[PDB]
Short mmCIF file of C-alpha atoms and ligand atoms in Angstrom, two decimals:
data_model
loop_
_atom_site.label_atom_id
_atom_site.label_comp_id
_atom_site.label_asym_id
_atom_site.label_seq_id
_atom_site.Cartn_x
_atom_site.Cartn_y
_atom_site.Cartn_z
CA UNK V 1 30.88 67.82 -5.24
CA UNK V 2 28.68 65.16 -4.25
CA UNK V 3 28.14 61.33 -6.53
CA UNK V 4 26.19 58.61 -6.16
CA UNK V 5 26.40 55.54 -8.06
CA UNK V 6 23.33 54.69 -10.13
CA UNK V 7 22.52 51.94 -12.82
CA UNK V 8 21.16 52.98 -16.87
CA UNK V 9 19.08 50.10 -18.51
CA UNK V 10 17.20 50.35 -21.99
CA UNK V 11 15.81 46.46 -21.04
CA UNK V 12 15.82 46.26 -17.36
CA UNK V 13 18.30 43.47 -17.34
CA UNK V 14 21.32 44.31 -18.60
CA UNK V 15 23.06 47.11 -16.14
CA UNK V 16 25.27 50.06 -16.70
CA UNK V 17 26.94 51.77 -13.95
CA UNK V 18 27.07 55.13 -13.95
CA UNK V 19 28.29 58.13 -11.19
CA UNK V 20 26.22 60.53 -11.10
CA UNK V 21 27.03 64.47 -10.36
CA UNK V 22 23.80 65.59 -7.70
CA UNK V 23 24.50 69.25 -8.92
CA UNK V 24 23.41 68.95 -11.98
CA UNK V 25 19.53 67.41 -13.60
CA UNK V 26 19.45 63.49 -14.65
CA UNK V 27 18.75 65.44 -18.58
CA UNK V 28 22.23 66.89 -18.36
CA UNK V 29 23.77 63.83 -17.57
CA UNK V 30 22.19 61.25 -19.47
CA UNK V 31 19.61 63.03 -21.79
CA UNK V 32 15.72 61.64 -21.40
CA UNK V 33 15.77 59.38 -17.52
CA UNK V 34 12.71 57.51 -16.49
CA UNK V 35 12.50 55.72 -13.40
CA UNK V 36 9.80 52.97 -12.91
CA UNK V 37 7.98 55.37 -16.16
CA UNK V 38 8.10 58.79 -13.92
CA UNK V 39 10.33 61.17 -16.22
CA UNK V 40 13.41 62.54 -13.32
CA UNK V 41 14.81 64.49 -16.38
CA UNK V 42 14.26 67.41 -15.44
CA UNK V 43 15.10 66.39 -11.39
CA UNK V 44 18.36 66.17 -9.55
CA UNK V 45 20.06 62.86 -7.99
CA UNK V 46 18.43 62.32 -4.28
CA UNK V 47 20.09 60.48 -1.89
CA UNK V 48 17.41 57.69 -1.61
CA UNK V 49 18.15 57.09 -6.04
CA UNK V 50 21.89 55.38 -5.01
CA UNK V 51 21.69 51.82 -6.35
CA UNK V 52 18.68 52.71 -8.47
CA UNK V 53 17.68 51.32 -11.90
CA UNK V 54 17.14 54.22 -14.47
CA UNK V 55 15.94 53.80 -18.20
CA UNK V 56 17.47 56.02 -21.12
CA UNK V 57 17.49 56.26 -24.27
CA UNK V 58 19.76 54.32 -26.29
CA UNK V 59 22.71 57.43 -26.75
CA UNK V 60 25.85 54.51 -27.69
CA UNK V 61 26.17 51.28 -29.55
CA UNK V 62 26.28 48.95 -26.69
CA UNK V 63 22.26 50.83 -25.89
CA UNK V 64 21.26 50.46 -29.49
CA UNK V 65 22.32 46.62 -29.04
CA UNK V 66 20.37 46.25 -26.33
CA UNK V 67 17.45 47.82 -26.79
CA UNK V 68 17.03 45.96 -30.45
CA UNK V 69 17.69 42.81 -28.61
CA UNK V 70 14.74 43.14 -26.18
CA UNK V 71 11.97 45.45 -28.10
CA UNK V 72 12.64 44.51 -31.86
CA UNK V 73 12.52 48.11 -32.61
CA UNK V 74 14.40 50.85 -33.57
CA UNK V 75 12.31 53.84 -33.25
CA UNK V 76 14.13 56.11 -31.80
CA UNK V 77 11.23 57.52 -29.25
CA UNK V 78 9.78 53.89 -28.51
CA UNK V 79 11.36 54.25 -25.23
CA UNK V 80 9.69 57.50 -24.62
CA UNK V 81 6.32 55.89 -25.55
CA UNK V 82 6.61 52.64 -23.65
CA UNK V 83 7.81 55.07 -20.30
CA UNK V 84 4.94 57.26 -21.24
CA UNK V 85 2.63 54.33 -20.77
CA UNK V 86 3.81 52.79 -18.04
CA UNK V 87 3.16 55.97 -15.96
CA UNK V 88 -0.49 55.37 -16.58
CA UNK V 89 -0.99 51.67 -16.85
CA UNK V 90 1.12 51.20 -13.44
CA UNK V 91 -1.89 53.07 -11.78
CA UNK V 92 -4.58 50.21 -13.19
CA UNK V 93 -6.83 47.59 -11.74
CA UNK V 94 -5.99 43.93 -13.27
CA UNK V 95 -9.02 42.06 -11.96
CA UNK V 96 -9.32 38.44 -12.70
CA UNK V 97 -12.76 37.65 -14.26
CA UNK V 98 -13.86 34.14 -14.49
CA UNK V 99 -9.74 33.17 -14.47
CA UNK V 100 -8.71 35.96 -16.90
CA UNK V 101 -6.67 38.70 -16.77
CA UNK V 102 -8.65 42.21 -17.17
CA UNK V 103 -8.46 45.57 -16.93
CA UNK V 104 -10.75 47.52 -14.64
CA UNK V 105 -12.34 50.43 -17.11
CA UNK V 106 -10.06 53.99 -17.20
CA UNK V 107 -8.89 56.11 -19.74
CA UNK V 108 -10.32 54.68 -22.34
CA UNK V 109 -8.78 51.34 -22.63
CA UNK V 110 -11.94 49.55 -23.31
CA UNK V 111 -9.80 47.84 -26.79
CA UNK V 112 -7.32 46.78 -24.88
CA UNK V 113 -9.17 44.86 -21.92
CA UNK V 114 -11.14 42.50 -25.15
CA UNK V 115 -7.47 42.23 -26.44
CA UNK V 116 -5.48 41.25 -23.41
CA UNK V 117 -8.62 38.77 -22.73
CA UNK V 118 -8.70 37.61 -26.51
CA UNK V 119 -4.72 36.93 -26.28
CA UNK V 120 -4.99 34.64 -23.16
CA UNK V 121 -7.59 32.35 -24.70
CA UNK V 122 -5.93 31.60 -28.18
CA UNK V 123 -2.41 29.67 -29.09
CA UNK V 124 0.39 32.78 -29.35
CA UNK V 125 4.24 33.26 -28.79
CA UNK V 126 5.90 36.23 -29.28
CA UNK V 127 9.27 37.48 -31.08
CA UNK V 128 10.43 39.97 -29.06
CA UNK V 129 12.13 39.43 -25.10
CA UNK V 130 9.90 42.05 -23.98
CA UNK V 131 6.39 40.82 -25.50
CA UNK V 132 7.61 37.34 -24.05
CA UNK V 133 8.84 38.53 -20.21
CA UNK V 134 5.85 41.06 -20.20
CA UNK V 135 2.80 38.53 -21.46
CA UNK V 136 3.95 36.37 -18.59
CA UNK V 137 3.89 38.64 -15.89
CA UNK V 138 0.32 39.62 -17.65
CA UNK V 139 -1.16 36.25 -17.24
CA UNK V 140 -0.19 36.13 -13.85
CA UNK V 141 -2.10 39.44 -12.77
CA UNK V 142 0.86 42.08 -13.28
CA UNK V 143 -0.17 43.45 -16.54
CA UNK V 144 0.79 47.10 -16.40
CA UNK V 145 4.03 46.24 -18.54
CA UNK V 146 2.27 44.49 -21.36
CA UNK V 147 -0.27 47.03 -21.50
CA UNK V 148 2.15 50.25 -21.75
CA UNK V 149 4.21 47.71 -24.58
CA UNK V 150 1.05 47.63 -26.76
CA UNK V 151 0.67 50.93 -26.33
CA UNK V 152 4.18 51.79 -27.41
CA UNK V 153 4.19 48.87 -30.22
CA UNK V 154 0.70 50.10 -31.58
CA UNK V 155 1.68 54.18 -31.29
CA UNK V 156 -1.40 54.27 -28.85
CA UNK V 157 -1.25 57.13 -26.34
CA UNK V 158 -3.21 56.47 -23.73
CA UNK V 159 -7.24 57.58 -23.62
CA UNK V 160 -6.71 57.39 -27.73
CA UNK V 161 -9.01 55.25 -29.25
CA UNK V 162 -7.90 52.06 -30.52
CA UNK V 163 -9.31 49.06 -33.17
CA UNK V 164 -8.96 45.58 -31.57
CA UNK V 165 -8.20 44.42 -35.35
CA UNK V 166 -5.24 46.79 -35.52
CA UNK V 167 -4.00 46.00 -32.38
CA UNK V 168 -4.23 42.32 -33.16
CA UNK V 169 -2.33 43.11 -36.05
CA UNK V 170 0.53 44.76 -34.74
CA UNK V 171 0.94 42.42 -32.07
CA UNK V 172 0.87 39.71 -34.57
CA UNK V 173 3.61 41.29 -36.44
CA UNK V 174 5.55 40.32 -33.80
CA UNK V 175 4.29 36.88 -32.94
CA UNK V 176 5.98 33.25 -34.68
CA UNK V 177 2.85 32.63 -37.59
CA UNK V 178 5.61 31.31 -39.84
CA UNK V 179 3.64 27.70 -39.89
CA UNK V 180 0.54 29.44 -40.91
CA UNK V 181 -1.05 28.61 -44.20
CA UNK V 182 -4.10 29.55 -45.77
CA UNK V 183 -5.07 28.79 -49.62
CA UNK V 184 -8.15 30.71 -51.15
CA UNK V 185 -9.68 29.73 -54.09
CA UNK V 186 -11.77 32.89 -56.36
CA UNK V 187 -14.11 31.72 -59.21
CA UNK V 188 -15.28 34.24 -61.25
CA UNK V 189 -17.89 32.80 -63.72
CA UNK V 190 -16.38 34.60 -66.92
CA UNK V 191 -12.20 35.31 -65.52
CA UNK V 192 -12.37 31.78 -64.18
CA UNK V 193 -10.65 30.22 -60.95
CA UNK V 194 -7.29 31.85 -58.93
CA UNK V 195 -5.65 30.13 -56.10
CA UNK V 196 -4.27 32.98 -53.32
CA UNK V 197 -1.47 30.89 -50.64
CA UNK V 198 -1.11 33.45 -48.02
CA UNK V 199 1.34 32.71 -44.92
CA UNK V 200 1.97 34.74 -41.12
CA UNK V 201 -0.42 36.97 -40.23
CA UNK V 202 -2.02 37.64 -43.80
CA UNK V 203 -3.28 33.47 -43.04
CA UNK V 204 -5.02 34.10 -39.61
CA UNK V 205 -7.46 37.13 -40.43
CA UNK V 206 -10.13 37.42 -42.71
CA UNK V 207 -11.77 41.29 -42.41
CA UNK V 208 -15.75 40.78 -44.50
CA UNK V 209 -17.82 38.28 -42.64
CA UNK V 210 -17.78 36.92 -38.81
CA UNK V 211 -18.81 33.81 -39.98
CA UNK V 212 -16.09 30.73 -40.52
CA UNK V 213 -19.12 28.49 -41.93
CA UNK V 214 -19.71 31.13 -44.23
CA UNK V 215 -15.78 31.26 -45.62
CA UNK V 216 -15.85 27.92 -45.81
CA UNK V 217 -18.62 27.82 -47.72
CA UNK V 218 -18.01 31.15 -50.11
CA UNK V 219 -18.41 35.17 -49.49
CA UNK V 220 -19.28 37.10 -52.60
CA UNK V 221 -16.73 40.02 -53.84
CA UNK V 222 -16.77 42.62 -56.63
CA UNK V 223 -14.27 40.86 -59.54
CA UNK V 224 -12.27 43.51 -61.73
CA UNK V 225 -14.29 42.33 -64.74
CA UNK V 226 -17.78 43.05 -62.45
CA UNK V 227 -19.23 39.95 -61.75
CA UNK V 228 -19.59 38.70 -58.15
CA UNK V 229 -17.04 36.22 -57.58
CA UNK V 230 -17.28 33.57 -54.65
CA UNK V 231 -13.72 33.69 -52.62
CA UNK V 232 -14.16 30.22 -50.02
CA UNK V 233 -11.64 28.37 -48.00
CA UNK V 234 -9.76 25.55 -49.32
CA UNK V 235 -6.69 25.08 -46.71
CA UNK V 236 -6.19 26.51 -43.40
CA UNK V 237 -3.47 26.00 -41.24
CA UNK V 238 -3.05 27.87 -37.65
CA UNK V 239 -4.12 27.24 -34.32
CA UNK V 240 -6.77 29.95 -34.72
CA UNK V 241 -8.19 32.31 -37.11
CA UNK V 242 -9.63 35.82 -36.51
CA UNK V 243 -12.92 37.02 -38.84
CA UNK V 244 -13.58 40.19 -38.67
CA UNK V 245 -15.85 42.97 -39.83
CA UNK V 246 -18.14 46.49 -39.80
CA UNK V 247 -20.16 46.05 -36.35
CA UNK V 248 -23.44 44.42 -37.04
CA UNK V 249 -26.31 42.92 -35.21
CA UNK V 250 -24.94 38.92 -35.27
CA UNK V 251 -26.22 36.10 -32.82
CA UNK V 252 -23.26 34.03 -30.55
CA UNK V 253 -23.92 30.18 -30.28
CA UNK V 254 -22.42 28.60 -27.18
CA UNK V 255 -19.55 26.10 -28.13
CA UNK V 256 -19.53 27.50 -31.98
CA UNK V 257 -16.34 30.30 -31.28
CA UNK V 258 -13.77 30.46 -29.06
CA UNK V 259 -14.30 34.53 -28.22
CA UNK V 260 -15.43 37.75 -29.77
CA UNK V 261 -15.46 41.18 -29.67
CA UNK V 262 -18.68 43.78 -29.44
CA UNK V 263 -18.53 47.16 -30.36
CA UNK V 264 -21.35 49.93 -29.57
CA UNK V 265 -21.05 53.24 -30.92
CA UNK V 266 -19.85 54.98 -34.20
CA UNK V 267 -15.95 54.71 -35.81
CA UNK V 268 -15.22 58.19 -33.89
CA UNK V 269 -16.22 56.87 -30.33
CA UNK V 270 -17.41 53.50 -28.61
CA UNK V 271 -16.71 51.15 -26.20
CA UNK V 272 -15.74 47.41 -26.95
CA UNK V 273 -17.22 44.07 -24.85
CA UNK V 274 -15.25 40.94 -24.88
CA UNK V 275 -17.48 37.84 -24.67
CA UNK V 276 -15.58 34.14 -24.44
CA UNK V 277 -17.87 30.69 -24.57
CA UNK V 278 -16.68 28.50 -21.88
CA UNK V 279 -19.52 26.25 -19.94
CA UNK V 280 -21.88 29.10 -21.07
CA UNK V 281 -21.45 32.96 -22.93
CA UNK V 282 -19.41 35.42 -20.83
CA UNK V 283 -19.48 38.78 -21.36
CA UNK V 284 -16.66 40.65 -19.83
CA UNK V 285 -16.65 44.30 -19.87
CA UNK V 286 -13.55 45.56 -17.95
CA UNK V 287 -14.50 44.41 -14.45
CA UNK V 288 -18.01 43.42 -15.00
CA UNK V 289 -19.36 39.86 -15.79
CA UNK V 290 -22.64 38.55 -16.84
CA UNK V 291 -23.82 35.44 -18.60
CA UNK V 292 -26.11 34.48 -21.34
CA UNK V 293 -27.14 31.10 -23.02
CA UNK V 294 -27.56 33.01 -26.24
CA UNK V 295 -25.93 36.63 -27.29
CA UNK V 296 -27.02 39.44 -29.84
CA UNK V 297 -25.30 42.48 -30.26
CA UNK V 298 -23.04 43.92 -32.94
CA UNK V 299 -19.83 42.21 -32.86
CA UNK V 300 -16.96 43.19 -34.76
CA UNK V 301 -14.16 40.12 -34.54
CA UNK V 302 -14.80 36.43 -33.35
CA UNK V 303 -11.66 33.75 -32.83
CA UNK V 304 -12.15 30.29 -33.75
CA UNK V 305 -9.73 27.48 -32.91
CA UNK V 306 -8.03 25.64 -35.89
CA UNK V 307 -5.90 22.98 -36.51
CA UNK V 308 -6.16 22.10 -40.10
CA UNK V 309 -9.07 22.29 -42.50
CA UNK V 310 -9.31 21.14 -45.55
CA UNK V 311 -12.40 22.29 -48.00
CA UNK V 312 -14.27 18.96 -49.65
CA UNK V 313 -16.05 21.19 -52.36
CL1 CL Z 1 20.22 47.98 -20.93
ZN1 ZN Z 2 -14.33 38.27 -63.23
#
């Protein structure tokens, strides 16, 4: 009978020592064991694994602690997913294009190079240890953790294709938007007018129109009596807000957004560009860069920065 001592983790901080039989599979032992994302379930203790860091599955109380601590989840396969992930993402390229973290173009991760680019350019902090710890690392180049965490947050597999709006939701979800405020005002000519306060995530994005000019000013909607109504802006407070909508054919002026998000193809299969206003337009696509001093294309979300607006109509 041969041990070794190894370590279980569900966060990668807090440690659990464990001896290990090298007779028997990692599975029989523990039940689902990842190291560094490679599944060793099915594989027997080594020699060269003493003093090693393993993830499982949260299988007691002190586990379930932990991992709620770190992920804000429960889901019982999250850790599954986020492993799962981290196999692949380990194995990308993290280029930094004109100071931002990207992600080199593979298995279809298009969506999530405009996201992680779209996240370092606006005003965000996030709930959960491992969104915090992994965003970090992210900004600084090592992004393969945050990447595989979307992934597992989202339910993403990866080469699935993925909505940047969705994704910004989720993420969102779990992001401090408690001090954000928005308050809507809807005349109808015959029903009248209806203040809306919305608050969190619900006060950042708009999905209808690109344009914040045009909320400001007033988008037409269907009423329940029939009429158009005009729904406009009257408070907004957040350090950004997303617009969003169906990809179409919309012009970019320098200095007028913070960044956007193009989309070519049909809802079944496409490929998102990221382009970001800085001294001039920037279109980033993965690991490509090109400029512009004016952009066309059909874009699907642009961020502005906010402070606080407040409607004079
Ligand atoms: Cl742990
Ligand atoms: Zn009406």
């Amino acid at each position: 009978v041969r041990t070794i001592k190894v370590f279980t983790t569900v966060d990668n901080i807090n440690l659990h020592t464990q001896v290990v039989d090298m007779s028997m599979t990692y599975g029989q032992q523990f039940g689902p064991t990842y190291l560094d994302g490679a599944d060793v379930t099915k594989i027997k203790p080594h020699n060269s694994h003493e003093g090693k860091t393993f993830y499982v599955l949260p299988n007691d109380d002190t586990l379930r602690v932990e991992a709620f601590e770190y992920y804000h989840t429960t889901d019982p396969s999250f850790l599954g997913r986020y492993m799962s992930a981290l196999n692949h993402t380990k194995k990308w390229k993290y280029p930094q294009v004109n100071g931002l973290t990207s992600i080199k173009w593979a298995d279809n991760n298009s969506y999530l190079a405009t996201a992680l680019l779209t996240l370092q350019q606006i005003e965000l902090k996030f709930n959960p240890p491992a969104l915090q710890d992994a965003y970090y690392r992210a900004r600084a180049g090592e992004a393969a953790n945050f990447c595989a965490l979307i992934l597992a947050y989202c339910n993403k597999t990866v080469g699935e294709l993925g909505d940047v709006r969705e994704t910004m939701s989720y993420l969102f979800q779990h992001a401090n938007l408690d001090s954000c405020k928005r308050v809507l005002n809807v005349v109808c000519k015959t029903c009248g007018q209806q203040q809306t306060t919305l608050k969190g995530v619900e006060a950042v994005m708009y999905m209808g129109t690109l344009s914040y000019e045009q909320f400001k000013k007033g988008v037409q909607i269907p009423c329940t009596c029939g009429k158009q109504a005009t729904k406009y802006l009257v408070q907004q407070e957040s350090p950004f807000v997303m617009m969003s909508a169906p990809p179409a054919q919309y012009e970019l002026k320098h200095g007028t957004f913070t960044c956007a998000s193009e989309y070519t193809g049909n809802y079944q299969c496409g490929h998102y560009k990221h382009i970001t206003s800085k001294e001039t337009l920037y279109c980033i696509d993965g690991a490509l860069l090109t400029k512009s001093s004016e952009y066309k294309g059909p874009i699907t979300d642009v961020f502005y920065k906010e402070n606080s607006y407040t409607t004079t109509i």
